[PDB]
Design a protein around this ligand. Structure first.
Ligand SMILES: COc1nc(C)nc(NC(=O)NS(=O)(=O)c2ccccc2Cl)n1
Ligand SMILES: COc1nc(C)nc(NC(=O)NS(=O)(=O)c2ccccc2Cl)n1
Lengths: 201, 203
């Protein structure tokens, strides 16, 4: 009947059945309680996903708050990288986090994040869209990689010899790129744009 | 007599009815009123179905894969991202349908001409490739988040703005009233400005 045991079991079930197979019914079953028992901790699948996402980001310490002396640039880098590693620590992590939003218990943290960026000279709007850009990019990079790896198993492999010369060279790079370098390339573009943006402002 | 276009039209309607998770070739054949081998000639499996749905969405909604005459690379990437976004938004789970795709052989000339264009404008082949991939990833991400949040919205209590701190309240107001397009355009402009900084560094 403990929140913590509910969440630990649910994380285990996530890894066993993935996000699409997860239900409150199967969690009640794995826990051995009557639906209304579970209901009081987790009212529906959506609330279960929301709780799972809070737990993942908490336990992997997604970097929501800047350290003293941390530049805004490094702060956004650390936020992205730590979020990414939190998402990659659980089956369908990115999918679980895709639908989340700040809970009331997180409003102080969220406010402090925006306060930090606006203290650097970003407008509220720009601080907001910066954080959102880093979030959606990070989600997109993880989700695209995951799905590309499934998809290439359900389709004939491409034939390199059929590729015209630039594309062939492109193909060869991407064979070797790795997920983390793709992610970091985009991340750095975003940070560099924000710097330019902050100067102009 | 079943034509490919009918398969695709009907599959796009079924996508809207049941979503990407619920879409199956069995349900499509039932919808078309045909036996399973008749459909199979057109789409061998669910992956082939998604591949063909993505191609149709991007074709119909005129995703900007080809630069205009005299178009700058900046305007090219803006138009690519924006048009791709609207294509993904045209159908339920549209971003998820495009998420697993890759160039087909029939698109290799398109993809070549895109790399030729970007290198002509002064990018290395490597940075031309990674630029396009970063814009694509950002655009998929934005629409993934938009479409999932649309569903999530109806499965939980709505927040209470009056209990929010000042800056977060201002943020909430912005997102509720301006919707997802300004946030998307902001991030796109960041990527373009980052790419300009990259050309300067490689000067
Ligand atoms: C940027 O990381 C992050 N993480 C979460 C969990 N949510 C958000 N943004 C968010 O929730 N935005 S919102 O528009 O849905 C919102 C909800 C409640 C209060 C304020 C706001 Cl802006 N970003
Ligand atoms: C940039 O928009 C876009 N659209 C599609 C459909 N695919 C891609 N990229 C892509 O397919 N990359 S790839 O590495 O899997 C590839 C496959 C075949 C030949 C070359 C390459 Cl690079 N981008």
């Amino acid at each position: 009947l403990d929140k913590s045991k509910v969440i630990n079991s649910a994380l285990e079930l996530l890894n066993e059945v993935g996000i699409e197979g997860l239900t409150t019914r199967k969690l009640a079953q794995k826990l051995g309680v009557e639906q209304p028992t579970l209901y009081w901790h987790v009212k529906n699948k959506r609330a279960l996903l929301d709780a799972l996402a809070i737990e993942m980001h908490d336990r992997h310490q997604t970097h929501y708050l800047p350290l003293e002396g941390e530049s805004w640039q490094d702060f956004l880098r650390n936020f992205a990288k730590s979020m990414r590693l939190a998402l990659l620590s659980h089956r369908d992590g990115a999918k679980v986090s895709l639908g989340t939003r700040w809970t009331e218990q997180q409003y102080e943290t969220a406010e402090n994040m925006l306060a930090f960026l606006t203290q650097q000279g970003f407008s509220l709007e720009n601080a907001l869209y910066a954080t959102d850009a880093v979030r959606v990019f990070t989600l997109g990079a993880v989700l695209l990689d995951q799905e590309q790896q499934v998809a290439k198993e359900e389709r004939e492999t491409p034939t390199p010899d059929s590729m015209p010369p630039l594309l062939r060279q492109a193909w060869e790079l991407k064979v070797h790129q790795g997920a983390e370098p793709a992610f970091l390339f985009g991340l750095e573009l975003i940070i560099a744009g924000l710097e330019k943006q902050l100067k102009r402002e």
